[PDB]
């Protein structure tokens, strides 16, 4: 029931340096006597009547309830011709800041990974894709517990259908995607599974920049971060080249991201058969 009002927020601080745009700290404090959020301002001059489209689009997502998956509290109008989204506040952030300033084992690495598997088999199972499974977009909380963030990209499934076809040329996080989004704009449930292996490559790698995706994905092709195009970076892929196996990476988990970057989207494991896999392998490393 909760509706938040722009009278009772008071702002602490930004939050992501700028990685997820403009996020801030604040405090909701109506009575005076208060819970932590995060707020996400959305520019939105795109006529009032698309806003509130996209507003509604956004509210959906409200229904959605996963403990590995952020909580997205409510969305105003600023009528200043944008939205406010109030999300939970997620503490430790994303793990590409948090990887490389801490020590963490093969095992805690594993039980992130497994984390992810079981948020993204509940959307994949209330019909939605993600479109933007990366390390940036996966925050920790206090008890070192994996949510989901970063929805901006989301999208319901359509009834009967085992794609969504993307429109548009945009800004696409390319070096994360499988090669039916780059090349024909079809999104999967088991593309999401490709940018999992990505996810999956960047945790173990501790998120080190210099091994990071596009580094090593233009460094394969040869050429610049200037000069790069989809076309390249398909063929490459096409040719069943491959990001390598990360230092101390065991074998069979290499193996686990080469299975989510099979060529063909059918022959990719589900989230729901990666979910007992990762348990059983997260076994043999523990303690
Ligand atoms: O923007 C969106 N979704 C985000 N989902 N997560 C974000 S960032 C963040 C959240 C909570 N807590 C945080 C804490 C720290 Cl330290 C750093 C960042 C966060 S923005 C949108 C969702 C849908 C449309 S747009």
Request: hydrophobic share 35%; proline share 5%.
């Amino acid at each position: 029931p909760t509706v938040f009002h722009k009278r009772y927020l008071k702002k602490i601080r930004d939050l992501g340096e700028g990685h997820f745009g403009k996020v801030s700290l604040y405090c909701y404090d109506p009575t005076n006597d208060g819970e932590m959020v995060a707020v996400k301002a959305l520019k939105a001059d795109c006529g009032p009547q698309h806003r509130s489209g996209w507003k509604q689009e956004i509210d959906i997502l409200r229904t959605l309830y996963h403990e590995h998956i952020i909580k997205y509290k409510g969305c105003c109008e600023d009528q200043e011709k944008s939205l406010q989204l109030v999300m939970e506040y997620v503490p430790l952030g994303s793990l590409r800041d948090y990887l490389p300033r801490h020590s963490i084992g093969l095992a805690q690495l594993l039980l992130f990974a497994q984390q992810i598997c079981e948020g993204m088999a509940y959307l994949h199972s209330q019909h939605y894709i993600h479109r933007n499974l990366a390390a940036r977009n996966v925050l920790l909380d206090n008890d070192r517990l994996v949510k989901i963030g970063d929805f901006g990209l989301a999208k319901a499934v359509p009834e009967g259908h085992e794609y969504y076809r993307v429109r548009e040329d945009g800004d696409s996080p390319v070096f994360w995607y499988a090669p039916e989004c780059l090349k024909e704009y079809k999104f999967y449930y088991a593309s999401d599974v490709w940018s999992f292996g990505v996810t999956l490559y960047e945790l173990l790698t501790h998120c080190d920049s210099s091994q990071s995706p596009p580094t090593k994905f233009l460094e394969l092709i040869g050429i610049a971060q200037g000069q790069m195009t989809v076309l390249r970076l398909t063929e490459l892929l096409e040719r069943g080249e491959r990001l390598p196996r990360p230092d101390k990476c065991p074998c069979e988990v290499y193996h686990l991201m080469k299975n989510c970057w099979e060529t063909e989207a059918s022959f990719r494991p589900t989230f729901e058969n990666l979910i007992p896999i990762l348990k059983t392998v997260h076994e043999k490393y523990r303690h």
